[PDB]
Design a protein around this ligand. Structure first.
Ligand code: CLA
Ligand code: CLA
Ligand code: CLA
Ligand code: CLA
Ligand code: CLA
Ligand code: CLA
Ligand code: CLA
Ligand code: CLA
Ligand code: CLA
Ligand SMILES: CCCCCCCCCCCCCCCC(=O)OC[C@H](COP(=O)(O)OC[C@@H](O)CO)OC(=O)CCCCCCCCCCCCCCC
Lengths: 39, 80, 741, 221, 74, 160, 78
């Protein structure tokens, strides 16, 4: 019960958010690379 | 010599006098406060200007206020 | 006297304090009213003395945190062994170690960073590592990647064991205060049981594993027909066919017939001509000798049985006329203060790491270590930087000892009291020797710049010009070159080819040459002494003037880490013991940067290079240290401008990450000066302007945004300065030496 | 495309230098942390470590922190002018047109490439006519780096150092005959901000004037 | 010189009974100053002077290696 | 036995170490031209200037722009004369500002009262001028008259 | 160059015993607390030291004996 409060702290959630955002961007630039502009 | 000026927004908490390292400040009786006392700076020629009194003041803006002026051998705090 | 006594379950293991940050400090527990709370959460997270006043709880926290740090280090080591096992060309490198570069990290191809996978040989693409793990595993007798995988698994198991021990020694069975005060038992078990038994076990490994596998490797046997190290023990016939004194048993050890062990316990001294490393017989004999010496030294101190010393009567008996009372009070200082122990241990570990750096370049312990110039340059630079950081941290913790753990009642007329009593005479003469060294080490360079600029090459401080030959170091070099056979009659060669002899060369490249010292070496060694002395001056001035001065006499009540006392007395800015560490970080940057620049130029110009078939050595730069390392323009032109041609032309190649890191370190160095030059009261007013714009759109944060504090502003500035400079020098060094080496 | 990005760097430099300058001009009379900033005047050191820390709060901080931004902006635009005009005057304009879009082209094809004849103004093999410009280059580096001493290290360290030096003078024989009329103290806080600023500035102009003149005089000379 | 300076310091100044101890002074002067010194000169003679008279260089390096007689100390 | 004592007054910021004030440094500092008991100014300055002018014809004679040239000893003499003149101007303006009584330490419990006045420091400066010129010229004459004098070959082979 | 190590004559054992006795004499003259020890029969024969003191003297005699045996083997004695 006290663990979920620690996971709800600012550094843990900002790390989870940044890893999720970086993973989404990396998985996008793997499957759809080299997008300098919208065609 | 520096100018230590005490204004009328003083609660008489005596924190400036206990924070002062060169006995510049003291407490005088005062009818305009709940604590019945206000700070005064008689021997302000001994003030170095460290502003420890300004650090310890609990007013929103400080009732005790140090103005750095002419520099003497005591304002510089020189052992030589 | 020395017994095991613990408290059972002193701290319960619950997650309720995980969700309550700032629990360790009373001031941090009121809640984050301002953003200074967030930085105070990290600044005081490990300062266990400010958390609790009981030394037993502090020592328990320290003992349990050491296990977590060891678990982190073991996770790191297991990760390195796993990268050697899975993502490396170590099996390819063992077949051809003279034409295949060591690589242990592949780069994922999601963006154009697939170019960062360098072509290193054997059909493997990856980053050319310079850590020297490959040469370390070759010296350890590791022949296949499964032995690295097993070591990685063992590192994970040991890291989990250390984590469990850290939980156990804080939440299940935590030792008392007097379990820490008996440093006699601790030091006996660290000398004999940790250093002695560790070096004895490594001596046994080097006898049974490293020596036969490495002798078969140097004899020309491919590693996948080389037998595994356990049939060398299980079948002693294969172990005794080479080095044939294993035919006789262990009885010559016990009858003191040690001489027949001379085939595999040698004192050859020099480098292996086949590999360029030290003889592994010399290393095994060395580890056995220092194991016996450390085990003997671990029986010095009285623990439980009457025999031994108590480390107090040794201190009590050491007293003279110039001191009087002596070392009385120092045992209580070192057994009641953790900061004095950290200041001693961190200084000795820093100087030890610097010794490691200065020794592994001249006497390379590993096969094909001196051949790969990148590994040697990287380990030298890395260990200099680590050692200097530890020395500055020692100055820091001496300053923390002086205001937080020093007691004047226990220290009357001893050594520490008298150092405090003549600190003005200490610091003023250190200031004079710093000024003298600065003038007569840097004004020589300024004079040489001036006379080379004014067309006066005969008025300079050069070998052709007015000479400044380091006659004492040359005499010591002559003593070491003639040491084998005269003062060390049972050494086949000298300890290193540095002091004399011939060019040790492996393949086509030079392992080591003699390093002749001239006017440039004299002048740069005096700059080394100067920069070391100024770092000593700032750190020691922070130590001695930590409690009081003529400026601020009541400075111990302000603490170790405070910004200033005010604008009075002219302005008492950066008076604290912390700010002397802050300035000493800049000066260790300057010192160690000049050290690694001297190394990277002297070895490239006068040691490293290729061997022509005629016999002459063609160096990397061409021996320009003799004439260009005497001028600042020569250091700028022939070293910084000339050798950074590789790091700036690295784009579109396999070393372009080094050019990226070069520019990134330049960015972080420039970014540091915003924090270093400016002050808090600018940024507080700027944040006040931003707060109103947030208030206009209902964007007021609950935690009020404050500017970083003055000490935190200095800390951020110095951390960015060191990071940006060190990353820059790392990138420059590695991209230069991965192109010319 | 190499002119778009440098123009936005220039716009960043003017806007930020304007931000320090407007910020210190409009907060000169006072603000939330320091209401009575007009009583101490234009140029004062601080208002103590109280109220969270009050370093660089005088309206002189605007000038002091905007000299750096003005020098950085003028460095950006003069590097722009010099590299574009070197591409024009050499006749190879493609170097700027392909390498100014990224900063390593700036760092390599403009700084490293055009410092070559500069730093070879004096070498072990002789002396050129640009030896005074190489000497000014190194002189500007020395003064610019000496400014870092006044800007990073602050006053009370030096006051504590000068106290030991004063003790050493007054306690040594044969030099305690020579007594100062005025007591040697460290440079004050605003004075040392100004001295480090002047060193930064003088080193900045000296080393860029040396690099500029030698870079475009070793080619077109 | 350092011994003479040391024996003027009050910690190491000998008492009057030590100076008038004739029995110990005679014992250490006949056994040690006259006997041990003559024995040491015999050691130098049989170790250095006699072999150097016979062409055998000894020095401080070889006196633990060059045995003065073919039947040494047996 | 505390060999490092105070000077008799512990709260004064100095220590009576062996180097500072024991037996051999109280003499030979009290017996130097400065702090000697019987000398007047223009005699202290004469002795000090003679020693200084003699020693300063060592890094100008063999260390200069002309040290490979036969004009080198003469240029070193002229440079020593110029430095002695600059130092005399410094002494003269230091006296002309106004001098106080010199600092009394543990090594020198008695300082010269004659150097505590502006007139005494003018005599000291004049004696320093005459002594410096005499010492520089004497060192020039000694170095020049044998024309080789192989003691000068030592510390010029070092300072090649 | 081997140091002529002299593989186990009886003079090696005699020298080891003699230097053990030398360690006994040195420890009986110079130790501070030799009476510490749990128990041993015949304290009169062992000079009134405990068992850890006995181990310390025997170990010091082994260090001294090893040093003198290797030194006098390298010189050529024994
Ligand atoms: C801050 C300025 C900035 C700008 C304008 C860009 C812009 C761009 N970068 Mg980038 N870049 C920058 C700084 C910046 N970068 C820096 C700081 C780095 C160094 C670390 C790089 C290094 C870098 C590389 C190495 C690469 C790019 C690429 C990209 C392009 C597309 C990225 C992508 O995945 O789009 C597609 C993303 C989406 C369509 C978004 C979909 C998901 C959203 C979030 C949800 C939408 C919900 C509705 C785009 C031109 C990539 C490219 O194609 O090059 C041209 C590429 O490979 N960048
Ligand atoms: C032979 C006995 C022995 C051995 C193996 C060690 C070894 C060690 N002790 Mg320990 N210690 C001992 C007995 C022993 N101790 C005694 C008797 C005392 C009590 C007085 C102490 C009290 C003590 C303290 C309080 C501290 C240590 C620490 C250390 C570690 C040093 C860090 C390092 O370099 O690890 C490298 C070496 C290894 C990882 C090898 C481990 C060998 C295993 C344990 C067998 C290491 C695990 C420090 C530490 O890091 O705590 C964890 C520390 O805080 N010890
Ligand atoms: C802590 C280190 C250590 C350990 C555990 C070992 C382990 C062992 N040694 Mg030893 N060895 C070591 C140190 C070590 N040694 C060192 C430092 C020396 C040099 C003096 C030697 C010299 C050595 C010899 C000469 C031999 C052993 C052998 C043995 C084995 C004993 C007999 C047997 O099992 O069969 C065993 C594997 C014997 C063996 O079987 O070798 C395979 C053997 O003949 N050892
Ligand atoms: C030149 C410096 C010097 C001098 C004058 C002394 C003087 C002293 N030492 Mg020694 N000692 C020193 C340096 C020195 N030591 C160093 C460098 C070490 C560390 C490696 C030691 C380690 C040491 C210990 C372990 C002990 C002494 C002790 C002694 C005392 C008896 C003399 C003796 O048997 O040891 C002479 C030893 C050397 C000259 C070496 C005496 C007060 C003993 C003591 O405490 O007496 C009260 C004792 O227990 N010493
Ligand atoms: C290039 C940059 C630079 C320079 C010149 C200095 C200069 C100095 N530093 Mg340093 N320092 C710097 C940057 C610099 N620092 C920065 C970045 C910081 C880090 C925050 C500091 C912080 C710092 C601290 C913390 C300390 C110093 C100290 C010192 C002094 C060392 C003594 C010495 O070498 O005297 C010799 C002087 C030089 C080598 C400078 C070159 C001068 C040449 C050789 C002589 C030319 C003079 C010329 C002939 C005069 C005639 C010209 C005429 C027209 C006037 C010296 C004055 C230490 C100190 O003062 O104690 C001794 C000390 O405590 N430094
Ligand atoms: C065994 C220990 C020992 C020894 C070696 C010494 C040694 C000495 N003691 Mg000493 N003494 C000792 C213990 C010892 N004493 C004891 C325990 C006591 C205390 C009771 C004294 C109390 C004591 C006193 C009170 C005095 C001495 C003095 C001296 C010195 C005598 C003068 C001298 O140097 O003549 C050395 C002379 C010879 C070796 C030769 C003597 C004449 C020979 C036999 C005649 C033949 C010479 C022969 C042909 C060789 C020729 C030489 C060659 C060129 C051919 C000498 C250094 C004196 C002193 O202070 O000196 C510093 C003194 O004042 N001692
Ligand atoms: C006090 C004077 C003195 C001293 C210090 C020495 C010293 C020594 N003698 Mg000796 N010697 C001396 C008197 C002296 N001698 C006299 C009086 C005689 C004549 C009887 C000899 C005849 C003699 C012989 C015959 C030999 C020694 C040897 C030795 C060595 C034995 C120790 C070792 O490690 O071996 C040693 C160098 C031995 C040696 O040199 O072996 C290395 C050897 O065999 N000695
Ligand atoms: C840069 C350092 C320097 C240099 C190169 C010299 C060089 C010279 N000095 Mg000088 N000197 C120096 C520093 C220097 N001095 C200092 C610091 C002192 C004070 C201790 C002296 C005191 C001194 C005396 C007392 C004498 C010299 C003399 C000499 C000359 C011969 C040296 C000799 O006899 O060597 C061998 C030579 C011109 C001699 C001289 O001037 O005679 C012409 C001489 O008599 N000098
Ligand atoms: C009196 C007996 C005796 C003799 C004659 C020797 C003689 C020697 N020892 Mg030695 N040794 C002795 C006792 C002795 N030792 C004792 C008591 C110890 C302490 C345990 C040692 C420990 C020892 C060490 C530490 C070393 C020697 C070594 C040496 C050799 C060269 C010494 C040197 O550098 O000069 C030489 C053969 C050296 C060698 O090469 O073996 C060496 O490393 N010895
Ligand atoms: C090796 C260091 C040389 C130390 C000088 C020894 C001299 C020395 O050890 O003195 C000996 C003296 C020891 O005094 P006592 O006899 O009271 O010492 C008893 C000791 O056991 C400590 O209790 O130490 C002092 O008085 C300190 C004075 C040092 C003051 C001189 C400054 C030294 C620093 C500058 C010299 C640097 C040279 C560095 C070369 C690497």
């Amino acid at each position: 019960k006290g663990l979920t409060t620690f996971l709800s702290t600012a550094p843990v959630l900002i790390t989870a958010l940044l890893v999720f955002t970086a993973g989404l961007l990396i998985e996008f630039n793997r499957f759809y690379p080299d997008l300098l502009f919208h065609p | 010599s520096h100018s230590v000026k005490i204004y009328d927004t003083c609660i008489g908490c005596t924190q400036c006098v206990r924070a002062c390292p060169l006995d510049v400040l003291e407490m005088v009786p005062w009818d305009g406060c709940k604590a019945g006392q206000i700070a005064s700076s008689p021997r302000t020629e001994d003030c170095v200007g460290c502003k420890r009194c300004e650090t310890a003041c609990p007013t929103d803006f400080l009732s005790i206020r140090v103005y750095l002026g002419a520099e003497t051998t005591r304002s510089m705090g020189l052992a030589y | 006297k020395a017994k095991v006594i613990v408290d059972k379950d002193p701290v319960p293991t619950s997650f309720e304090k995980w969700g309550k940050p700032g629990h360790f400090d009373r001031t941090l527990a009121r809640g984050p009213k301002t953003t200074t709370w967030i930085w105070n959460l990290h600044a005081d997270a490990h300062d266990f003395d400010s958390q609790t006043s009981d030394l037993e709880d502090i020592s328990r926290k320290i003992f349990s945190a050491h296990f977590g740090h060891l678990a982190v280090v073991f996770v790191w080591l297991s990760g390195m062994y796993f990268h050697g096992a899975k993502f490396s060309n170590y099996s390819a490198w063992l077949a051809d170690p003279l034409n295949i570069k060591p690589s242990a990290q592949v780069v994922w191809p999601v963006v154009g960073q697939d170019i960062l996978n360098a072509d290193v040989g054997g059909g493997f693409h990856g980053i050319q590592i310079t850590s020297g793990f490959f040469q370390l595993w070759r010296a350890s007798g590791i022949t296949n990647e499964y032995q690295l995988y097993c070591t990685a698994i063992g590192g994970l198991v040991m890291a989990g064991l250390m984590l469990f021990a850290g939980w156990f020694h804080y939440h299940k069975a935590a030792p008392k205060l007097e379990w820490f005060q008996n440093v006699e038992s601790m030091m006996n078990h660290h000398l004999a049981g940790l250093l002695g038994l560790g070096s004895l076990g490594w001596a046994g490994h080097q006898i049974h594993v490293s020596l036969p596998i490495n002798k078969l490797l140097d004899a020309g046997v491919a590693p996948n027909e080389i037998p595994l190290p356990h049939e060398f023990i299980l079948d002693p016939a294969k172990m005794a066919e080479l080095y044939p004194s294993f035919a006789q048993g262990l009885t010559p050890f016990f009858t003191l017939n040690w001489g027949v062990y001379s085939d595999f316990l040698t004192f050859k001294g020099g480098l292996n001509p086949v590999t360029g490393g030290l003889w592994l017989s010399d290393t095994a004999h060395h580890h056995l000798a220092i194991a016996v010496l450390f085990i003997i030294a671990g029986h010095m101190y009285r623990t439980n049985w009457g025999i031994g010393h108590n480390m107090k009567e040794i201190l009590e008996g050491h007293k003279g006329p110039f001191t009087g009372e002596g070392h009385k009070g120092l045992y209580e200082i070192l057994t009641t203060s953790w900061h004095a122990q950290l200041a001693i241990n961190l200084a000795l570990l820093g100087s030890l790491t610097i010794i490691v750096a200065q020794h592994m370049y001249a006497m390379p312990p590993y096969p094909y270590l001196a051949t790969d110039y990148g590994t040697q340059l990287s380990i030298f630079t890395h260990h200099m930087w680590i050692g200097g950081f530890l020395i500055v941290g020692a100055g820091a913790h001496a300053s923390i000892f002086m205001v937080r753990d020093y007691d004047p009642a226990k220290n009357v007329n001893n050594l520490l009291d008298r150092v405090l009593r003549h600190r003005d005479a200490i610091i003023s003469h250190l200031n004079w020797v710093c000024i003298w060294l600065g003038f007569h080490s840097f004004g020589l360079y300024i004079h040489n710049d001036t006379m080379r600029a004014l067309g006066r090459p005969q008025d300079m401080f050069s070998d052709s010009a007015i000479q400044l030959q380091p006659v004492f170091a040359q005499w010591i070099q002559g003593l070491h070159a003639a040491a084998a056979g005269a003062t060390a009659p049972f050494a086949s060669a000298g300890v290193s080819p540095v002091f004399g002899g011939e060019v040790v060369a492996v393949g086509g490249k030079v392992a080591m040459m003699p390093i002749t010292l001239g006017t440039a070496d004299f002048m740069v060694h005096h700059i080394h002494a100067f920069t070391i002395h100024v770092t000593v001056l700032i750190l020691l001035k922070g130590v001695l003037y930590s409690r009081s001065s003529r400026l601020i006499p009541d400075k111990a009540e302000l603490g170790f880490r405070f910004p200033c006392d005010g604008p009075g007395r002219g302005g008492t800015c950066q008076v604290s013991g912390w700010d002397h560490v802050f300035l000493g970080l800049f000066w260790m940057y300057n010192s160690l940067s000049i050290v690694i620049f001297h190394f990277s130029w002297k070895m490239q110009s006068d040691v490293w290079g290729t061997v022509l078939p005629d016999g002459s050595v063609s160096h990397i730069t061409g021996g320009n240290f003799a004439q260009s390392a005497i001028t600042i323009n020569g250091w700028l032109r022939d070293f910084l401008w000339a050798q950074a041609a590789n790091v700036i032309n690295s784009y579109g190649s396999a070393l372009s990450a080094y050019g990226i890191m070069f520019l990134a370190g330049h960015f972080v160095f420039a970014f540091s000066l915003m924090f270093l030059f400016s002050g808090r009261g600018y940024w507080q007013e700027l944040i006040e302007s931003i707060v109103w714009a947030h208030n206009k759109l209902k964007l007021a944060p609950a935690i009020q945004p404050r500017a970083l504090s003055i000490v935190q502003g200095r800390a951020v500035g110095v951390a960015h300065y060191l990071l940006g400079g060190i990353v820059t020098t790392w990138a420059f060094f590695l991209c230069r030496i991965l192109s010319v080496g | 495309p190499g002119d778009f990005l440098v123009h936005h760097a220039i716009a960043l430099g003017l806007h930020t230098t304007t931000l320090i300058l407007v910020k210190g001009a409009l907060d000169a009379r006072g603000s939330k942390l320091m209401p009575d900033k007009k009583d101490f005047g234009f140029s004062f050191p601080c208002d103590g470590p109280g109220r969270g820390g009050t370093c660089d709060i005088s309206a002189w901080d605007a000038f002091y922190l905007a000299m750096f931004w003005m020098l950085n902006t003028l460095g950006w635009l003069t590097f722009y002018w010099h590299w574009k005009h070197l591409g024009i005057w050499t006749g190879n304009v493609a170097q700027f047109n392909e390498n100014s879009t990224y900063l390593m082209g700036w760092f390599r094809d403009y700084l490293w490439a055009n410092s070559a004849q500069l730093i070879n103004g004096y070498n072990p093999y002789g002396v050129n006519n640009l030896s005074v410009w190489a000497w000014m280059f190194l002189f500007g580096h020395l003064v610019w780096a000496t400014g870092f001493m006044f800007l990073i290290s602050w006053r009370g360290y030096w006051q504590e150092l000068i106290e030991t030096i004063v003790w050493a003078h007054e306690r040594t024989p044969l030099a305690n005959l020579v007594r100062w009329k005025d007591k040697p103290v460290a440079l004050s806080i605003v004075q040392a901000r100004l001295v480090g600023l002047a060193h930064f500035t003088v080193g900045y102009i000296l080393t860029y004037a040396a690099f500029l003149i030698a870079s475009t005089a070793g080619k077109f000379g | 010189l350092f011994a003479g300076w040391l024996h003027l310091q009050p910690k190491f100044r000998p008492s009057l009974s030590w100076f008038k101890n004739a029995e110990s002074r005679l014992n250490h002067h006949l056994a040690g100053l006259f006997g041990v010194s003559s024995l040491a000169w015999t050691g130098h003679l049989v170790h250095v002077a006699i072999p150097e008279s016979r062409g055998v260089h000894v020095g401080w390096d070889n006196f633990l290696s060059v045995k003065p007689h073919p039947a040494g100390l047996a | 036995i505390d060999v490092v004592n105070h000077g008799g007054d512990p709260q004064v910021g100095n220590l009576s170490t062996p180097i500072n004030g024991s037996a051999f440094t109280k003499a030979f500092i009290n017996a130097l031209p400065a702090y000697r008991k019987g000398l007047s100014p223009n005699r202290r300055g004469l002795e000090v200037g003679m020693a200084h002018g003699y020693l300063l014809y060592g890094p100008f004679a063999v260390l200069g722009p002309l040290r490979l040239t036969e004009y080198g000893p003469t240029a070193g003499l002229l440079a020593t004369i110029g430095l002695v003149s600059i130092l005399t101007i410094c002494l003269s303006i230091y006296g002309a500002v106004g001098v106080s009584k010199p600092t009394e330490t543990l090594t020198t419990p008695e300082v010269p009262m004659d150097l505590a006045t502006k007139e005494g420091w003018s005599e000291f400066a004049g004696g320093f001028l005459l002594g410096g010129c005499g010492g520089a010229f004497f060192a020039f004459f000694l170095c020049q008259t044998p024309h080789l004098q192989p003691l000068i070959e030592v510390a010029s082979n070092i300072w090649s | 160059a081997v140091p002529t190590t002299l593989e186990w004559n009886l003079n090696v054992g005699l020298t080891m015993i003699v230097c053990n006795i030398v360690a006994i004499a040195f420890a009986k003259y110079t130790m501070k607390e030799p009476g510490a020890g749990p128990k041993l029969p015949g304290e009169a024969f062992f000079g009134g030291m405990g068992l850890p003191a006995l181990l310390a003297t025997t170990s010091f005699g082994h260090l001294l004996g090893a040093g003198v045996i290797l030194g006098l083997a390298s010189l050529g004695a024994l």
